[PDB]
């Protein structure tokens, strides 16, 4: 949600900034709803003044021995219309609230203005993509050799976009997630959390997936119970820890990390790049609004540190205005080198949401200067999507015989295995 | 599913064995559908109806299973360890965990409603340490091959292990428009056992031993309103075996020993119960439950269920192996056991390891996973 006062008073300036994202704010409907509210409000003030005067005139008419029936009838009608004016004002505000829940976040002024992914800029890259002495195999070919990466059995169980891992490939995937959580908790100041993987609709509205992106979620319909949704990311469960709260400024920043499965039914056919279920180690920050853009740089560096320690070549992209997620003011995407594709592929998105999610969940902090509750800023970033990191490890660490060399940092988690297959 | 030949040649003995479970075999409806189809063929709708009945029949209990009507007829076969005598008033896991916000039911209820939990900091780390310890133990010492599986399955996998068609109400279903519906797994038994469905294994591939650490999702109305003992979501480290039928009862003893070893290493006193005929799960021929000591309850509470399913799930899945003696593809036997339910192990750890001041001693085997933490709070 954007500042409702800003949307109502400056629709044209808000529309100009949203236009950089290719989003067309319905200024005509906002102005028409505002004109309707003003018209009804002026009528209710005129009515309130009229009714109060007629009610007091009854007392005076009684003192004169006069007929109070014309005054009682005016009071009754005026009161009835005032009740309608209230239902009208609530229905107008209700329509405006529903509209304001469908508006994307305002991009920060430091975001390059662009209409598509071609206006995204490379910020930096680290590491050199290996030049192999043989014909590179993709993760599917590498993993299928001994049945340790199995899409056929997964399809037998669950249909398309699922995977089964076994033996050393299952162990490597677990080693990756453990490595990620251990790193963020030990060196990056994150507090570990285990969360529910099923949430009700208010949590999803809090982070922005609802009301607009319901179709991308798996929903569990329940008889005379609130519906449950499978989390698309731990961002939903973690960010909502602080919903409806007034935090002490001394508690900021609140830094959370969770390793969870992530479920998406969103409308890369071969492999585990795009899945209905995938593990992701998620980093979430609840911060002082004054520090959030600096916090984003640190968040992006925490995700980068995983790729650097795994010696995986990667690139950092600054997303342009036309290529950002709904709730983001600024995003950095990390893309890892994928030998079989001869290109970098997305492995993380690190975003500053500003006060947009905090407004939807009423996540506040008490400002030390004013002593008043103010909205916190929120940030989230993948550190990292675990299945995609597995794809990157298998392909970058492949040897001539189809075996996989175990990354140095993963050897303590691999029970003596240094070479897979 | 039961051997259809047995249901045909011995209906009275099969009905008498099922009666010990409190199940009444509709011998008349089977005898009628057999006499009708024999007349209909002599002169496919009757088959579809018999199949539905056949799929609603629970497994035959093994002869060694104690006969009893309910949980009060369960037999304690052995125990391990001495439940600790505390020199102060014992607190439950809820009071222990809530102290610093590290176990939070309130934030979890705000997110998802009742029967969910949020863990943070050292309690979240302790839960993760428990699941890592369990999967590391079974893979290094007990011969299990690790597996990562889907947590969403379609209806055939659940029918393969027995949750479908009879127990649909206990599952969370994701209704999908113009696609087959998905169900959240109630246990990794579902995904793991179905690995071998519709296959003919080589006898040399046996025993196939799988271990997975997965969340488990259940919506059961039949069954602990306070705490994380009963949850709509809980982690569990599942052990599954696909075996040669001649070895399955010996395999059950080894599987139960694998679950017990987790409790022994964590120094958690427990007891082993042989479930009676009337307290057995639908797909089991024989079950041992492990019940861990819970100091605030002054009793042992279920933490694991280890079962031999015989050829029941193998029949539903058409999971076979080529018998080396006959050359014929024969049904395998399947087994499954919790090694262990992670949330309930965390409950057992917080309560058994609690100190007078409300702090929690870290079990010895978990100290390598706790990043220097030896005392929680
Ligand atoms: N909470 C934020 C930051 O993690 C978020 O979820 N953003 S994201 O870009 O939608 O998702 C975060 C990351 O998840 C991975 N991913 C996505 C879809 C899929 O099928 N498989 C994947 O591995 C992508 O690499 C992506 O950068
Ligand atoms: N696949 C087999 C063997 O694990 C199986 O699922 N059996 S079981 O008994 O249904 O479930 C296995 C175990 O899961 C635990 N449990 C159960 C319900 C709940 O809400 N929370 C729990 O922690 C119980 O300790 C139980 O013994
Ligand atoms: Na993205
Ligand atoms: Na049980």
PDB file of C-alpha atoms and ligand atoms in Angstrom, chain A residues 232-233 235 264 272-276 278-280 282 333 346-350 380-382 385-388, ligand 1:
ATOM      1  CA  UNK A 232       5.447 -18.922  -1.994  1.00  0.00           C
ATOM      2  CA  UNK A 233       8.525 -17.739   0.057  1.00  0.00           C
ATOM      3  CA  UNK A 235       9.274 -13.659   3.128  1.00  0.00           C
ATOM      4  CA  UNK A 264       4.113 -21.597  -6.484  1.00  0.00           C
ATOM      5  CA  UNK A 272      14.749 -28.062 -11.568  1.00  0.00           C
ATOM      6  CA  UNK A 273      15.158 -24.328 -12.475  1.00  0.00           C
ATOM      7  CA  UNK A 274      11.355 -23.738 -12.255  1.00  0.00           C
ATOM      8  CA  UNK A 275       9.490 -25.912  -9.737  1.00  0.00           C
ATOM      9  CA  UNK A 276       6.078 -26.031  -7.984  1.00  0.00           C
ATOM     10  CA  UNK A 278      11.748 -25.525  -4.116  1.00  0.00           C
ATOM     11  CA  UNK A 279      13.868 -24.845  -1.014  1.00  0.00           C
ATOM     12  CA  UNK A 280      15.074 -21.338  -0.366  1.00  0.00           C
ATOM     13  CA  UNK A 282      15.360 -16.435   2.965  1.00  0.00           C
ATOM     14  CA  UNK A 333      19.082  -9.591  -8.771  1.00  0.00           C
ATOM     15  CA  UNK A 346      18.761 -15.675 -11.639  1.00  0.00           C
ATOM     16  CA  UNK A 347      19.470 -17.256  -8.177  1.00  0.00           C
ATOM     17  CA  UNK A 348      18.352 -14.374  -5.851  1.00  0.00           C
ATOM     18  CA  UNK A 349      16.309 -11.135  -5.773  1.00  0.00           C
ATOM     19  CA  UNK A 350      17.175  -8.654  -2.936  1.00  0.00           C
ATOM     20  CA  UNK A 380      13.911  -9.430   1.790  1.00  0.00           C
ATOM     21  CA  UNK A 381      16.455 -11.349  -0.254  1.00  0.00           C
ATOM     22  CA  UNK A 382      17.223 -14.936  -1.287  1.00  0.00           C
ATOM     23  CA  UNK A 385      17.224 -20.410  -3.734  1.00  0.00           C
ATOM     24  CA  UNK A 386      18.702 -23.896  -2.834  1.00  0.00           C
ATOM     25  CA  UNK A 387      17.642 -25.936  -5.916  1.00  0.00           C
ATOM     26  CA  UNK A 388      19.155 -23.283  -8.265  1.00  0.00           C
TER      27      UNK A 388
HETATM   28  N1  LIG C   1      11.144 -13.287  -1.016  1.00  0.00           N
HETATM   29  C1  LIG C   1      11.837 -12.789  -2.223  1.00  0.00           C
HETATM   30  C2  LIG C   1      13.360 -12.901  -2.141  1.00  0.00           C
HETATM   31  O1  LIG C   1      13.733 -14.256  -1.925  1.00  0.00           O
HETATM   32  C3  LIG C   1      11.314 -13.667  -3.370  1.00  0.00           C
HETATM   33  O2  LIG C   1      10.707 -14.727  -3.204  1.00  0.00           O
HETATM   34  N2  LIG C   1      11.613 -13.224  -4.699  1.00  0.00           N
HETATM   35  S1  LIG C   1      11.533 -14.089  -6.041  1.00  0.00           S
HETATM   36  O3  LIG C   1      12.372 -13.473  -7.007  1.00  0.00           O
HETATM   37  O4  LIG C   1      10.155 -14.322  -6.304  1.00  0.00           O
HETATM   38  O5  LIG C   1      12.124 -15.537  -5.707  1.00  0.00           O
HETATM   39  C4  LIG C   1      13.433 -15.651  -5.067  1.00  0.00           C
HETATM   40  C5  LIG C   1      14.282 -16.554  -5.924  1.00  0.00           C
HETATM   41  O6  LIG C   1      13.668 -17.852  -6.020  1.00  0.00           O
HETATM   42  C6  LIG C   1      14.231 -18.509  -7.146  1.00  0.00           C
HETATM   43  N3  LIG C   1      13.203 -19.370  -7.745  1.00  0.00           N
HETATM   44  C7  LIG C   1      12.008 -18.825  -8.204  1.00  0.00           C
HETATM   45  C8  LIG C   1      11.058 -19.581  -8.785  1.00  0.00           C
HETATM   46  C9  LIG C   1      11.274 -20.992  -8.951  1.00  0.00           C
HETATM   47  O7  LIG C   1      10.522 -21.768  -9.538  1.00  0.00           O
HETATM   48  N4  LIG C   1      12.468 -21.465  -8.438  1.00  0.00           N
HETATM   49  C10 LIG C   1      13.452 -20.729  -7.823  1.00  0.00           C
HETATM   50  O8  LIG C   1      14.434 -21.259  -7.322  1.00  0.00           O
HETATM   51  C11 LIG C   1      14.768 -17.424  -8.100  1.00  0.00           C
HETATM   52  O9  LIG C   1      16.169 -17.561  -8.270  1.00  0.00           O
HETATM   53  C12 LIG C   1      14.433 -16.114  -7.373  1.00  0.00           C
HETATM   54  O10 LIG C   1      15.475 -15.157  -7.506  1.00  0.00           O
END
